[PDB]
């Protein structure tokens, strides 16, 4: 006789939340993005990569925007290589890593069918193209959501579920088992570095490499860890929010986290065109201090932008992307 399941479900999914709008000046929908912009990452030179076309006649693709232009226009990056099947390319989280000779690597979570891999590409800037280097999969990478690169083929990955089969995983989620987990992957060594998560989702790292941040979507929490020289993670603190936190970006200059969120779990998980999900963007400053300063920078009911997952800032501008629909480019 335990209504505990119903009340635990109602809080994880935030079932009655209604967005308090927070407005920005000069918001423009990005021309050419209509099939999602689930993750994005901006380089220090202002080039932004965006994954798009995620599925749970328009393919998965990676898009490029040059945010130094006054009206940035998106372009599709061509994938070259014969080691990747691009017909099933279905991109999700992404990360970059810039090596010492200045080579830019792009890592992309890919879901061909219901499996996960991480695809490593080298960015060829002049040609506007991604050279495929390699496809990574692993038994400890069953259901990958996002990664943060710490080398050309080294990364921490979140897995949003423990199970791969879609029936199993959807039950796994509804029951609140919280068996999802985080994996450190390298050529030499692959191991679980944290576990027990209710829907681990965004992940990122501080600019000095000392701290890893992990979003726990359905617990509405961001976990902060100290990252050791040997890649171990030790819990340092946990932030709680009243919203479902999706992808984390890090401002390289200050270290602030910028977070894409879903106010209402029902509207994002149980989709319908008559009642679309809204959007919400959080800024988090001084995440190690006694009180982190948390600010809603943008929030709206979804009549302009539906289902924000990610946001990042570049030179006074905010770029926001979503799981399945548009993207928004605003003044701060
Ligand atoms: Ca990412
Ligand atoms: Ca995500």
Tab-separated table of C-alpha atoms and ligand atoms in Angstrom:
chain	number	residue	atom	x	y	z
A	1	UNK	CA	0.000	0.000	0.000
A	2	UNK	CA	2.829	2.392	-0.903
A	3	UNK	CA	1.864	5.624	-2.691
A	4	UNK	CA	5.646	6.184	-2.367
A	5	UNK	CA	6.244	5.361	-6.029
A	6	UNK	CA	3.632	7.936	-7.142
A	7	UNK	CA	5.039	10.674	-4.873
A	8	UNK	CA	8.655	9.828	-5.798
A	9	UNK	CA	7.696	9.924	-9.508
A	10	UNK	CA	5.913	13.276	-9.080
A	11	UNK	CA	8.990	14.910	-7.634
A	12	UNK	CA	11.608	13.364	-10.062
A	13	UNK	CA	9.533	14.434	-13.068
A	14	UNK	CA	8.555	17.783	-11.436
A	15	UNK	CA	5.049	17.068	-12.664
A	16	UNK	CA	3.245	20.314	-11.884
A	17	UNK	CA	6.130	22.882	-12.415
A	18	UNK	CA	5.349	25.977	-14.479
A	19	UNK	CA	8.143	28.207	-15.783
A	20	UNK	CA	8.701	31.696	-14.445
A	21	UNK	CA	9.821	33.505	-17.628
A	22	UNK	CA	13.144	35.348	-17.622
A	23	UNK	CA	13.698	37.416	-20.757
A	24	UNK	CA	16.767	38.446	-22.782
A	25	UNK	CA	17.156	41.221	-25.355
A	26	UNK	CA	17.671	40.370	-29.004
A	27	UNK	CA	16.830	36.647	-29.103
A	28	UNK	CA	16.902	35.228	-32.639
A	29	UNK	CA	16.217	31.682	-33.694
A	30	UNK	CA	19.162	30.285	-35.528
A	31	UNK	CA	18.388	29.948	-39.259
A	32	UNK	CA	18.898	26.338	-40.370
A	33	UNK	CA	18.407	24.463	-37.090
A	34	UNK	CA	15.084	22.644	-37.006
A	35	UNK	CA	15.852	19.099	-35.928
A	36	UNK	CA	17.646	19.606	-32.659
A	37	UNK	CA	20.837	21.031	-31.257
A	38	UNK	CA	21.167	18.782	-28.239
A	39	UNK	CA	24.778	19.544	-27.400
A	40	UNK	CA	27.224	22.182	-28.408
A	41	UNK	CA	30.705	23.344	-27.500
A	42	UNK	CA	32.418	26.611	-28.262
A	43	UNK	CA	36.239	26.680	-28.823
A	44	UNK	CA	38.354	29.645	-27.393
A	45	UNK	CA	38.593	31.040	-30.981
A	46	UNK	CA	34.780	31.322	-31.092
A	47	UNK	CA	34.013	28.356	-33.427
A	48	UNK	CA	30.958	26.456	-32.106
A	49	UNK	CA	30.157	22.796	-32.893
A	50	UNK	CA	26.569	21.605	-32.552
A	51	UNK	CA	25.225	18.055	-32.781
A	52	UNK	CA	21.856	17.822	-34.392
A	53	UNK	CA	19.255	15.497	-35.777
A	54	UNK	CA	19.147	13.231	-32.736
A	55	UNK	CA	16.642	10.311	-32.824
A	56	UNK	CA	15.485	8.521	-29.623
A	57	UNK	CA	14.557	12.968	-44.625
A	58	UNK	CA	17.023	14.739	-42.180
A	59	UNK	CA	20.203	12.974	-40.962
A	60	UNK	CA	22.286	13.208	-37.864
A	61	UNK	CA	24.897	15.906	-38.506
A	62	UNK	CA	27.465	18.111	-36.879
A	63	UNK	CA	27.047	21.840	-37.573
A	64	UNK	CA	29.571	24.654	-37.251
A	65	UNK	CA	28.940	28.282	-36.377
A	66	UNK	CA	31.560	31.018	-36.276
A	67	UNK	CA	30.398	33.160	-33.352
A	68	UNK	CA	32.883	35.967	-34.250
A	69	UNK	CA	30.587	36.803	-37.216
A	70	UNK	CA	27.920	39.428	-36.526
A	71	UNK	CA	25.093	37.171	-37.923
A	72	UNK	CA	26.584	33.657	-37.446
A	73	UNK	CA	25.343	31.243	-40.123
A	74	UNK	CA	25.371	27.486	-39.574
A	75	UNK	CA	27.082	25.118	-41.908
A	76	UNK	CA	27.034	21.299	-42.068
A	77	UNK	CA	30.471	19.792	-41.482
A	78	UNK	CA	31.269	17.046	-44.071
A	79	UNK	CA	32.424	13.739	-42.503
A	80	UNK	CA	35.330	12.190	-44.329
A	81	UNK	CA	36.844	8.741	-43.802
A	82	UNK	CA	35.954	5.172	-44.738
A	83	UNK	CA	35.936	3.863	-41.166
A	84	UNK	CA	32.451	5.275	-40.176
A	85	UNK	CA	28.999	4.398	-41.544
A	86	UNK	CA	27.430	7.895	-41.827
A	87	UNK	CA	24.017	6.616	-42.943
A	88	UNK	CA	23.159	5.675	-39.380
A	89	UNK	CA	24.997	8.605	-37.707
A	90	UNK	CA	22.870	9.802	-34.805
A	91	UNK	CA	24.864	12.272	-32.704
A	92	UNK	CA	24.168	13.172	-28.992
A	93	UNK	CA	26.665	14.689	-26.478
A	94	UNK	CA	29.947	16.010	-27.805
A	95	UNK	CA	33.246	17.354	-26.419
A	96	UNK	CA	36.459	18.733	-27.890
A	97	UNK	CA	40.049	18.459	-26.905
A	98	UNK	CA	42.804	20.688	-28.269
A	99	UNK	CA	46.231	19.026	-28.249
A	100	UNK	CA	49.652	20.691	-27.822
A	101	UNK	CA	50.296	21.064	-31.606
A	102	UNK	CA	46.920	22.775	-31.767
A	103	UNK	CA	44.972	19.891	-33.444
A	104	UNK	CA	41.310	20.039	-32.451
A	105	UNK	CA	39.606	16.720	-31.716
A	106	UNK	CA	35.855	16.299	-31.688
A	107	UNK	CA	34.355	13.394	-29.755
A	108	UNK	CA	30.709	12.597	-30.463
A	109	UNK	CA	28.347	10.151	-28.738
A	110	UNK	CA	26.595	8.246	-31.507
A	111	UNK	CA	23.535	5.914	-31.287
A	112	UNK	CA	23.395	3.725	-34.391
A	113	UNK	CA	20.228	1.613	-33.651
A	114	UNK	CA	19.988	1.331	-29.820
A	115	UNK	CA	23.737	0.825	-29.050
A	116	UNK	CA	26.206	3.532	-28.031
A	117	UNK	CA	29.595	4.435	-29.409
A	118	UNK	CA	31.863	7.468	-29.127
A	119	UNK	CA	33.243	8.678	-32.486
A	120	UNK	CA	36.550	10.498	-32.556
A	121	UNK	CA	37.122	13.015	-35.386
A	122	UNK	CA	39.874	15.483	-36.197
A	123	UNK	CA	38.615	18.962	-37.115
A	124	UNK	CA	40.053	20.247	-40.463
A	125	UNK	CA	39.331	23.946	-40.093
A	126	UNK	CA	40.224	25.194	-43.582
A	127	UNK	CA	38.135	22.527	-45.321
A	128	UNK	CA	35.269	22.668	-42.796
A	129	UNK	CA	35.285	18.942	-42.434
A	130	UNK	CA	35.651	16.255	-39.753
A	131	UNK	CA	38.102	13.413	-40.503
A	132	UNK	CA	36.867	10.251	-38.713
A	133	UNK	CA	39.626	8.645	-36.664
A	134	UNK	CA	37.886	6.038	-34.661
A	135	UNK	CA	34.813	4.360	-33.193
A	136	UNK	CA	34.941	3.437	-29.515
A	137	UNK	CA	32.566	1.066	-27.746
A	138	UNK	CA	32.781	-0.792	-24.522
A	139	UNK	CA	30.733	-2.848	-22.190
A	140	UNK	CA	31.089	0.007	-19.568
A	141	UNK	CA	29.677	2.443	-22.199
A	142	UNK	CA	26.200	0.820	-22.500
A	143	UNK	CA	23.998	3.963	-22.731
A	144	UNK	CA	26.140	7.035	-23.178
A	145	UNK	CA	24.632	10.512	-22.907
A	146	UNK	CA	27.583	12.915	-22.785
A	147	UNK	CA	31.453	12.914	-22.526
A	148	UNK	CA	34.150	15.314	-21.524
A	149	UNK	CA	37.440	14.788	-23.409
A	150	UNK	CA	40.705	14.878	-21.451
A	151	UNK	CA	42.821	13.686	-24.426
A	152	UNK	CA	42.272	12.732	-28.132
A	153	UNK	CA	40.800	9.308	-26.996
A	154	UNK	CA	40.466	9.702	-23.273
A	155	UNK	CA	37.212	10.910	-21.673
A	156	UNK	CA	34.766	10.623	-18.855
A	157	UNK	CA	31.360	9.416	-20.056
A	158	UNK	CA	27.977	9.469	-18.431
A	159	UNK	CA	25.669	6.571	-19.004
A	160	UNK	CA	22.043	7.664	-18.524
A	161	UNK	CA	20.834	4.067	-17.953
A	162	UNK	CA	22.344	0.819	-16.918
A	163	UNK	CA	20.344	-1.227	-19.490
A	164	UNK	CA	20.626	-1.075	-23.293
A	165	UNK	CA	17.320	-2.655	-24.358
A	166	UNK	CA	14.740	0.162	-24.800
A	167	UNK	CA	11.916	-1.698	-22.987
A	168	UNK	CA	14.192	-2.513	-20.046
A	169	UNK	CA	15.672	0.933	-19.816
A	170	UNK	CA	12.287	2.658	-19.856
A	171	UNK	CA	11.155	0.443	-16.967
A	172	UNK	CA	14.529	1.003	-15.252
A	173	UNK	CA	13.825	4.728	-15.375
A	174	UNK	CA	10.151	4.571	-14.229
A	175	UNK	CA	11.107	2.467	-11.228
A	176	UNK	CA	13.777	4.957	-10.060
A	177	UNK	CA	16.417	2.191	-9.716
A	178	UNK	CA	19.212	4.823	-10.200
A	179	UNK	CA	21.788	2.306	-11.573
A	180	UNK	CA	23.203	4.715	-14.096
A	181	UNK	CA	26.939	5.423	-13.881
A	182	UNK	CA	30.051	7.291	-15.071
A	183	UNK	CA	33.035	5.685	-16.884
A	184	UNK	CA	36.577	6.888	-17.467
A	185	UNK	CA	37.752	5.576	-20.877
A	186	UNK	CA	41.325	5.509	-22.135
A	187	UNK	CA	43.269	3.232	-24.551
A	188	UNK	CA	45.157	1.746	-21.560
A	189	UNK	CA	42.291	1.425	-19.016
A	190	UNK	CA	38.503	1.566	-18.756
A	191	UNK	CA	36.749	1.710	-15.442
A	192	UNK	CA	33.633	2.859	-13.593
A	193	UNK	CA	34.429	6.007	-11.563
A	194	UNK	CA	31.050	6.789	-9.950
A	195	UNK	CA	27.669	5.099	-9.739
A	196	UNK	CA	24.132	5.036	-8.276
A	197	UNK	CA	22.820	7.896	-10.499
A	198	UNK	CA	19.216	8.670	-11.350
A	199	UNK	CA	19.807	9.597	-15.067
A	200	UNK	CA	23.433	10.884	-15.276
A	201	UNK	CA	23.452	13.331	-18.118
A	202	UNK	CA	25.760	16.384	-18.611
A	203	UNK	CA	29.391	16.235	-17.656
A	204	UNK	CA	32.224	18.677	-17.855
A	205	UNK	CA	35.486	19.766	-16.236
A	206	UNK	CA	37.064	22.950	-14.768
A	207	UNK	CA	39.623	24.791	-17.025
A	208	UNK	CA	42.518	23.702	-14.779
A	209	UNK	CA	41.405	20.055	-14.979
A	210	UNK	CA	41.093	19.625	-11.194
A	211	UNK	CA	37.295	19.298	-10.882
A	212	UNK	CA	34.705	17.231	-12.746
A	213	UNK	CA	30.973	18.200	-12.727
A	214	UNK	CA	28.184	15.688	-13.405
A	215	UNK	CA	24.496	16.422	-13.872
A	216	UNK	CA	21.972	14.016	-12.400
A	217	UNK	CA	18.819	14.831	-14.413
A	218	UNK	CA	16.023	13.219	-12.465
A	219	UNK	CA	17.557	13.837	-9.059
A	220	UNK	CA	17.863	17.554	-10.097
A	221	UNK	CA	21.508	17.693	-8.796
A	222	UNK	CA	25.003	18.584	-9.924
A	223	UNK	CA	27.787	16.576	-8.355
A	224	UNK	CA	31.264	18.075	-8.053
A	225	UNK	CA	34.315	15.772	-7.792
A	226	UNK	CA	38.014	16.231	-7.295
A	227	UNK	CA	39.787	14.578	-10.240
A	228	UNK	CA	43.114	12.858	-9.198
A	229	UNK	CA	46.303	12.633	-11.387
A	230	UNK	CA	45.378	8.897	-11.875
A	231	UNK	CA	41.787	9.817	-13.053
A	232	UNK	CA	39.960	8.697	-9.913
A	233	UNK	CA	37.003	10.959	-8.823
A	234	UNK	CA	36.287	11.804	-5.172
A	235	UNK	CA	32.942	13.431	-4.260
A	236	UNK	CA	33.393	16.970	-3.033
A	237	UNK	CA	29.887	18.511	-3.010
A	238	UNK	CA	26.386	18.186	-4.377
A	239	UNK	CA	24.238	21.090	-5.582
A	240	UNK	CA	20.446	20.706	-5.581
A	241	UNK	CA	18.036	22.616	-7.934
A	242	UNK	CA	14.280	22.737	-8.479
A	243	UNK	CA	14.754	21.836	-12.179
A	244	UNK	CA	15.962	18.873	-14.369
A	245	UNK	CA	19.590	19.718	-15.283
A	246	UNK	CA	20.721	18.430	-18.696
A	247	UNK	CA	24.082	19.478	-20.299
A	248	UNK	CA	26.858	21.487	-18.570
A	249	UNK	CA	29.160	24.015	-20.344
A	250	UNK	CA	32.073	25.683	-18.632
A	251	UNK	CA	33.095	29.271	-19.279
A	252	UNK	CA	36.903	28.900	-19.679
A	253	UNK	CA	37.571	32.429	-18.419
A	254	UNK	CA	35.745	32.302	-15.079
A	255	UNK	CA	35.041	28.585	-14.661
A	256	UNK	CA	31.244	29.259	-14.294
A	257	UNK	CA	28.920	26.430	-15.239
A	258	UNK	CA	26.158	27.267	-17.739
A	259	UNK	CA	23.388	24.723	-17.620
A	260	UNK	CA	20.585	23.743	-19.962
A	261	UNK	CA	17.444	22.611	-18.006
A	262	UNK	CA	13.928	21.227	-18.339
A	263	UNK	CA	11.541	22.812	-15.791
A	264	UNK	CA	8.889	20.056	-16.290
A	265	UNK	CA	9.839	16.399	-16.733
A	266	UNK	CA	6.417	15.402	-18.073
A	267	UNK	CA	6.547	17.771	-21.025
A	268	UNK	CA	9.976	16.660	-22.067
A	269	UNK	CA	9.533	12.842	-21.567
A	270	UNK	CA	5.874	12.447	-22.649
A	271	UNK	CA	5.860	14.728	-25.682
A	272	UNK	CA	2.889	16.328	-27.299
A	273	UNK	CA	2.763	19.159	-29.812
A	274	UNK	CA	-0.269	20.809	-27.895
A	275	UNK	CA	1.731	21.266	-24.654
A	276	UNK	CA	5.422	21.549	-25.554
A	277	UNK	CA	8.274	21.729	-22.984
A	278	UNK	CA	9.758	25.133	-22.169
A	279	UNK	CA	13.387	26.107	-21.631
A	280	UNK	CA	15.602	27.278	-18.783
A	281	UNK	CA	19.296	28.273	-18.535
A	282	UNK	CA	21.166	28.504	-15.213
A	283	UNK	CA	24.470	30.142	-14.508
A	284	UNK	CA	26.511	28.778	-11.517
A	285	UNK	CA	29.342	30.799	-10.070
A	286	UNK	CA	31.857	29.812	-7.349
A	287	UNK	CA	30.722	26.216	-7.218
A	288	UNK	CA	33.228	25.348	-4.411
A	289	UNK	CA	32.268	28.125	-2.024
A	290	UNK	CA	29.802	27.753	0.868
A	291	UNK	CA	26.994	29.451	-1.221
A	292	UNK	CA	27.284	29.068	-4.938
A	293	UNK	CA	25.591	31.864	-6.710
A	294	UNK	CA	22.885	30.304	-9.004
A	295	UNK	CA	21.044	32.547	-11.509
A	296	UNK	CA	18.280	31.832	-13.978
A	297	UNK	CA	19.595	33.707	-17.060
A	298	UNK	CA	16.838	32.677	-19.501
A	299	UNK	CA	13.490	30.848	-19.048
A	300	UNK	CA	10.314	30.711	-21.210
A	301	UNK	CA	7.259	28.477	-21.649
A	302	UNK	CA	8.389	27.034	-25.000
A	303	UNK	CA	6.376	29.220	-27.316
A	304	UNK	CA	9.675	30.402	-28.819
A	305	UNK	CA	12.214	27.696	-27.783
A	306	UNK	CA	11.102	24.143	-26.813
A	307	UNK	CA	13.210	21.728	-24.751
A	308	UNK	CA	16.548	23.459	-23.980
A	309	UNK	CA	19.371	21.114	-23.137
A	310	UNK	CA	22.534	23.171	-23.374
A	311	UNK	CA	23.772	26.778	-23.268
A	312	UNK	CA	27.148	28.460	-23.585
A	313	UNK	CA	28.405	31.999	-23.714
A	314	UNK	CA	30.770	33.761	-25.990
A	315	UNK	CA	31.628	37.416	-25.952
A	316	UNK	CA	28.381	38.760	-24.457
A	317	UNK	CA	26.162	36.266	-26.301
A	318	UNK	CA	24.277	33.190	-25.247
A	319	UNK	CA	23.756	30.202	-27.498
A	320	UNK	CA	21.027	27.774	-26.436
A	321	UNK	CA	20.236	24.425	-28.009
A	322	UNK	CA	17.431	21.818	-27.569
A	323	UNK	CA	16.928	18.057	-27.806
A	324	UNK	CA	14.734	18.056	-30.944
A	325	UNK	CA	13.962	21.460	-32.259
A	326	UNK	CA	15.491	24.899	-32.664
A	327	UNK	CA	18.306	26.951	-31.214
A	328	UNK	CA	18.395	30.511	-29.906
A	329	UNK	CA	21.140	33.142	-30.095
A	330	UNK	CA	20.679	36.075	-27.609
A	331	UNK	CA	22.447	39.067	-26.103
A	332	UNK	CA	23.258	38.604	-22.323
B	1	LIG	CA1	29.190	17.865	-23.943
B	2	LIG	CA1	22.319	15.468	-22.417
